[PDB]
Design a protein around this ligand. Structure first.
Ligand SMILES: Nc1ncnc2c1ncn2[C@@H]1O[C@H](CO)[C@@H](O)[C@H]1O[C@H]1O[C@H](CO)[C@@H](O)[C@H]1O
Ligand code: ZN
Length: 47
């Protein structure tokens, strides 16, 4: 199985959709031009 958030959807070069979690639009370029979740997935320790 696997129900974790290790990547979400390849969002390393995305700015930030203004709608956010309540985004009712689903276009092909809208999921690649902006991102809906700004969670940390790379810098959480720095060693
Ligand atoms: N909750 C919510 N999410 C996304 N977009 C939303 C929205 N509430 C309203 N909008 C957009 O604003 C205008 C109002 O003038 C609506 O027509 C919505 O426009 C959406 O439609 C397109 C994609 O289907 C986009 O232009 C998006 O803005
Ligand atoms: Zn959006």
């Amino acid at each position: 199985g696997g129900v974790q958030i290790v990547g979400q959807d390849e969002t390393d070069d995305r700015p930030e959709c203004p709608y956010g979690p309540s985004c009712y639009r689903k276009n092909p370029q809208h999921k690649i031009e902006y991102r809906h979740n700004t969670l940390p997935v790379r810098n959480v320790l720095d060693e």
